[PDB]
């Protein structure tokens, strides 16, 4: 204490930032990975206030920018998912050890450190060790050196607000926050059909035109990223979306409009010449349908415990049969309105939502065409409702897998919602208590899907209080192997199930499995055939008398 300096030296923030930015400059004629970054900076940190905004897609676009320049690229993209609290340097050290000790990978390689949200007390020491001090050291082992010529990118979600401003930082924002001050599309996604075809129909739906003229000329129509963003923001319902929901909406609309185009209903309207006005009701009901699916919304349990909606809420479900050429209607009823139209209601009460949808000549056409409209599933037998399901799910020649499972209307709304959620591309996560039947529900779905084959389809993965991540990647990898085997030999798709998948610190790795389709940095195969379904316990406090 007697050798104390009562001065506390300090420097301004722009001086430190200019110092680090000037000493991170990779020079010319070095053939580095930094030539695609901000004029050779070689270290970046991408952050945001909220998640789902496009950090990893920015990293991927920088990676493909480095693919484009410097031909015969063959560049690796090393991904190290840091996922545990009380952060360990030996994990990222052992992940980086077998990489740059071969001296044929001294070609420029983009490195991409991914720091998750559950790493509470180990961040600035690791950041200052890697980015400033340029070393990772083991006490009994080797020493890593950060090299001027390998580009590094360290994610962080948002104390740290003061600390993360030192490094050369590139920030990213939701589409609401880049439409007022600044394109915003990923240009390879706008050229993709999944964002083109729903735009191709919503462009003609916004200002009123008849959809009797055929679309999808397989090329991009003359549009802009900003006006497409304007359409997808005004047609989503929620007022502050991330980039996840807006992409979810677009893939959902792609899947339902592909199911509409796969039917002969447009061909029947062409050959009958009095069926039109149908597709306006189609796209309007799919806006309602997508508002039903992908639009949600104690002071520290407020983002968790506050459930905005439950199953005690009307979910009007519509589905298009693939092989067979009719439709179905589950969850809502149609009754005559006094203004000359037909409104939609939910059973057991009176609700007058979604007025003024469509006209009478379409009802004349579908009454002529004999579609199953306005049927209440309280008084149907077992074979009729299983036939309705096998028409709905596309299953041919149904065999009843279990008559002990009593199928109520909630137990078929959940079936339909779950199967289309893993059909179109949304991640499937279940918020439910212990007493609710989810394992039996997904077992019934898997047994109905496999029908009569004795192969293993449903694989339960139990997630307990001491589940390390390594067994989770091992189980997901062996689920991939049995998925390839099952689709190779039986043409059958499997279901991977995570039950009480909320207790571990590896819930970020659980998010890594299905939300982005990448395991341990390796991309999951979209053509493999695999559906990951996870379940979490709800967040609520005990009673105060219980604590007493």
């Amino acid at each position: 204490s007697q050798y104390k300096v009562p001065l506390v030296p300090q420097a301004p923030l722009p001086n430190i930032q200019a110092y680090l930015q000037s000493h991170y400059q990779v020079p010319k004629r070095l053939l580095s990975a930094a030539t695609v970054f901000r004029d050779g900076l070689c270290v970046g940190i991408v952050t945001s206030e909220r998640a789902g905004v496009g950090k990893s897609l920015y990293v991927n676009t920088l990676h493909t920018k480095l693919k484009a320049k410097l031909r015969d690229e063959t560049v690796p993209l090393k991904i190290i998912r840091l996922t545990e609290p009380h952060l360990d340097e030996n994990q990222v050290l052992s992940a980086l050890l077998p990489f740059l000790k071969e001296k044929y990978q001294k070609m420029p390689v983009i490195f991409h450190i991914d720091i998750s949200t559950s790493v509470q007390t180990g961040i600035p020491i690791f950041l200052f060790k890697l980015l400033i001090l340029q070393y990772l050291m083991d006490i009994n082992g080797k020493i890593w050196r950060r090299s001027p010529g390998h580009l590094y990118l360290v994610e962080i979600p948002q104390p740290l607000f003061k600390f993360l401003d030192l490094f050369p930082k590139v920030t990213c924002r939701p589409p609401k926050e880049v439409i007022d001050m600044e394109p915003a599309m990923d240009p390879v996604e706008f050229c993709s059909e999944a964002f083109q075809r729903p735009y191709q129909y919503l462009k003609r739906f916004h200002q009123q035109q008849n959809l009797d003229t055929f679309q999808y000329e397989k090329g991009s129509v003359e549009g802009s990223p900003e006006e497409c963003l304007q359409h997808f923001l005004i047609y989503c319902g929620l007022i502050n979306p991330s980039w996840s929901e807006l992409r979810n909406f677009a893939w959902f609309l792609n899947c339902q409009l592909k199911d509409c185009e796969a039917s002969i209903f447009c061909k029947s309207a062409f050959t009958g010449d009095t069926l039109r006005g149908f597709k306006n009701f189609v796209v309007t009901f799919m806006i309602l349908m997508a508002r039903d699916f992908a639009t949600p919304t104690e002071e520290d349990l407020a983002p968790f415990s506050l459930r905005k909606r439950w199953e005690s809420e009307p979910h009007p479900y519509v589905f298009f049969n693939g092989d067979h050429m009719t439709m179905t209607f589950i969850g809502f009823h149609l009754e005559t309105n006094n203004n000359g139209y037909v409104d939609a209601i939910n059973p057991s009460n009176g609700k007058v939502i979604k007025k003024d949808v469509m006209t009478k000549e379409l009802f004349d056409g579908l009454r002529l065409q004999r579609v199953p409209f306005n049927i209440d599933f309280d008084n149907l037998p077992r074979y009729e409702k299983l036939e309705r399901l096998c028409l709905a799910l596309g299953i041919e020649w149904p065999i009843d897998p279990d008559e002990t499972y009593e199928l109520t209307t909630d137990n078929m709304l959940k079936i339909l919602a779950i199967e289309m959620r893993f059909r179109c591309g949304i991640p499937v996560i279940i918020m439910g208590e212990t007493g609710c039947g989810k394992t039996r529900l997904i077992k019934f779905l898997s047994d109905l899907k496999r029908g009569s084959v004795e192969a293993e389809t449903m694989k339960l993965v139990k997630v307990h209080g001491g589940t390390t991540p390594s067994m989770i990647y091992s189980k997901v990898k062996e689920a991939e192997r049995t998925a390839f085997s099952n689709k190779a030999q039986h043409k059958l798709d499997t279901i991977l199930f995570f039950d009480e998948a909320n207790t571990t610190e590896a819930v970020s790795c659980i998010k890594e499995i299905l939300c982005d389709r990448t395991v341990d940095g390796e991309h999951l195969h979209e053509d493999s055939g695999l559906h990951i379904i996870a379940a979490c316990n709800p967040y609520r406090k005990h009673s105060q008398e219980m604590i007493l």
Binding site: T404, E406, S543, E545, M546
Partner: protein
Amino acid sequence: NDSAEKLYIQQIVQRLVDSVSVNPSETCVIADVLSASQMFMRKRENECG
């Protein structure tokens, strides 16, 4: 919502007692006393877990 709870408890007791010769009628007694215990659990300010 406990409308189907008496259905679920009766299905479990008829599936897991294996009552091929126990009683044709007392399985309803077992099912609704289990449902009465479940309703007494629900008609209380808290549960255990």
